[PDB]
């Protein structure tokens, strides 16, 4: 009741005690890189409906797309062809996944089931949730850090279909997650304006960051392991930390009203892409909110985004069945 | 080599694009529905109805309801203060950004439940009510035609010619004869003809 209202004030005093300066003040440094732009180098016109989420492969070529038409097309970003075209049980999928060994593709959406495919037939249908799924990632070839909408990030085992650790307790719908480069801890943005980093080893919360005013759509992670950025439905992309526990910047302009749909960093972390909702996707510079390119294109949405393992060419999805590759 | 690798995938690029175009003539002929408050497929005179459902998902609908923005008709089944909490749902589907161009079908519930309990108004503008005609009793048709007027009181303030409400009073032939009216009135508003 009232016995826990004073313990939170010990954190708000401590998190403001470590606020020595700002990123906006200590970056009196070299100039921004000017207006950058990218032209659509490919166009993967194969789908029939909206692309809700894709995932660029670990091979830096073979991306996997997942649309609401029932298709899971394992594309090819080099010869534009289609290596496979996997049909699905239920017509909706909201996320797809790619193993780092390049030999597994996981996909599953509003049908409450994370299915496992091996690049054509099913392998294991890891049911057990009581909500829609929102993001699936691979740790190794037998372990996935799934999200849900039932307030619970889980961790299945593809051998014998068991839930090893249930990262429970978020008081709201969970949305897209990410993964550290060390693959031992993962953040989870959710519909409570709270990006709560968990821990795979222990199996509970390690921190909890709150800097948003509305629900969180998608999230990313920094390419070293000491930060992560988060986009929400109020046209903002806040950049948090892990050793200072406070947000540093807020990437927002005056005119933008539409909410963020997907966020992913570059290879060196300097360029923070952001898939907006007003039919384009900006390129925010991570040390100063310069907005160094409008990067137009699609005419319905920018529903998902993803950068390669080598940082070569991003792949903004859409809601009119067109992927585009930008280098 | 560099001559068999290009033919390694072009035999798979042209065995798949000859299959997707044989599946494109099935997705284009399936009409998606949504029985808003587990899939089912029925047909009526050789057209495929891909009626969805939401039964297992929780009661917080703001992120699996923008996943249904290509559906042609949201079957908004409602009952006859249960109405007021089930009208702000319809108030929010209408004024939404992604479900804006989706013409809602509305099914009021069993009319004997509004006929047994009258022989309880919960609204201020129910006493001064001038009832319309073409019903059956005047003590029942004055009550049934109020929520059928209240649900249509919002549907004309943001109609804009794109999406209308098509209220009924309860059967697959009554959706087939109304899903045709959605397709005809969609093709007519783009011709600058309606």
């Amino acid at each position: 009741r009232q016995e826990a209202e004073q313990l939170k004030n010990q954190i708000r005093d401590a998190r403001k005690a470590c606020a020595d300066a700002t990123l906006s003040q200590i970056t009196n440094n070299i100039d921004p890189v000017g207006r950058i732009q990218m032209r659509t180098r490919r166009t993967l016109r194969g789908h029939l409906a909206k692309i809700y989420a894709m995932h660029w492969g670990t091979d830096s070529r073979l991306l996997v797309s997942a649309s609401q038409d029932g298709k899971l097309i394992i594309w090819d970003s080099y010869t534009t062809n289609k290596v496979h075209a996997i049909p699905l049980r239920s017509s909706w999928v909201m996320t797809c996944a790619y193993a780092p060994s390049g030999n597994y593709v996981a996909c599953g959406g509003l049908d409450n089931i994370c299915s496992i495919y091996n690049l054509v037939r099913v392998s294991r249908e890891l049911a057990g949730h009581t909500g829609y799924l929102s993001c699936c990632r691979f740790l190794d070839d037998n372990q996935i850090v799934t999200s849900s909408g039932d307030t619970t990030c889980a961790l299945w085992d593809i051998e014998t279909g068991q839930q090893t650790t249930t990262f429970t307790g978020h008081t709201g719908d969970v949305m897209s997650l990410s993964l550290a480069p060390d693959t031992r801890l993962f953040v989870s943005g959710a519909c409570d304006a709270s990006a709560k980093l968990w821990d795979v080893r222990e199996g509970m919360c390690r921190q909890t960051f709150t800097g948003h005013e509305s629900d969180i759509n998608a999230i990313c992670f920094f390419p070293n392991g000491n930060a992560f950025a988060t986009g929400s439905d109020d046209a903002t992309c806040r950049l948090f930390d892990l050793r200072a526990d406070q947000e540093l910047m807020t990437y927002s302009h005056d005119n933008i009203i539409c909410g963020i749909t997907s966020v992913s960093f570059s290879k060196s972390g300097r360029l923070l892409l952001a898939g907006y909702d007003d039919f384009n996707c900006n390129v925010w510079d991570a040390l100063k909110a310069d907005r160094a390119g409008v990067l137009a294109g699609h005419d319905n949405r920018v529903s998902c985004l993803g950068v390669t393992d080598d940082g070569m060419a991003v792949a903004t999805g859409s809601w009119d069945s067109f992927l585009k590759i930008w280098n | 080599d560099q001559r068999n690798e290009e033919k390694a995938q072009r035999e798979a690029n042209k065995k798949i694009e000859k299959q997707l175009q044989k599946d494109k003539q099935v997705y284009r002929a399936t009409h998606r529905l949504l029985l808003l408050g587990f899939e089912t497929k029925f047909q009526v005179d050789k057209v495929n109805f891909h009626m969805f459902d939401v039964g297992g998902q929780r009661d917080e609908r703001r992120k699996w309801i923008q996943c249904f923005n290509d559906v042609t008709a949201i079957i908004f089944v409602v009952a006859s203060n249960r109405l007021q909490e089930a009208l702000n749902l319809f108030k929010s589907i209408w004024n939404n950004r992604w479900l804006r161009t989706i013409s809602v079908i509305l099914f009021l519930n069993k009319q004997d439940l509004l006929a047994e309990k009258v022989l309880e108004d919960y609204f201020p503008e129910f006493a001064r009510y001038t009832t319309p005609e073409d019903a059956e009793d005047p003590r029942v048709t004055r009550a049934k035609y109020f929520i059928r007027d209240e649900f249509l009181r919002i549907s004309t303030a943001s109609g804009d010619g794109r999406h209308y409400c098509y209220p009924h009073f309860t059967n697959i032939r009554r959706v087939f004869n109304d899903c045709r009216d959605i397709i005809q009135r969609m093709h007519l508003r783009q011709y600058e003809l309606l």
Partner: nanobody
Framework: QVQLQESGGQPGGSLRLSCAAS????????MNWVRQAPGKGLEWVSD????????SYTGSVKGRFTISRDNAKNTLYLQMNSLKPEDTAVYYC?????????????????????RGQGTQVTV
């Protein structure tokens, strides 16, 4: 964070309920009150638009009460003129989950928790 505190308190008297909004911008949020009598589920009571235009109500609390947001002190006020014995309810000050919209899904169950309790009003 998003702190929604509440304040304020014989059938037929009067009551005035005040709140706060610390953490977000208050100029562009479609705030609304939601009450729940004990034993039953949550109902709807009122609404306030982004400027003070579309002041809606429910069926039974129509005309009696009067609500106006301030938009200068991050506060909205629910003036309860001519109260009733059927208003024995706890009054949660809800929130509209997206800036610059005209829809609200803020009626349902306990899927939001980071908010003050809301004062208990009995008759």
């Amino acid at each position: 964070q998003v702190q929604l505190q509440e304040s304020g308190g014989q059938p037929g008297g009067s009551l005035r309920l005040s709140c706060a909004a610390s953490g977000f911008t208050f100029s562009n949020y479609k705030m609304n009150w939601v009450r729940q009598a004990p034993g039953k589920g949550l109902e709807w009571v009122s609404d306030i638009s982004q400027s003070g235009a579309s002041i809606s109500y429910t069926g039974s609390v129509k005309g009696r009460f009067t609500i106006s947001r301030d938009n200068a002190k991050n506060t909205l006020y629910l003036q309860m003129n001519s109260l009733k014995p059927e208003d024995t309810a706890v009054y949660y000050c809800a929130r509209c989950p997206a800036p610059f919209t005209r829809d609200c899904f803020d009626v349902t169950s306990t899927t939001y928790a980071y908010r003050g309790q809301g004062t208990q009003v009995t008759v």
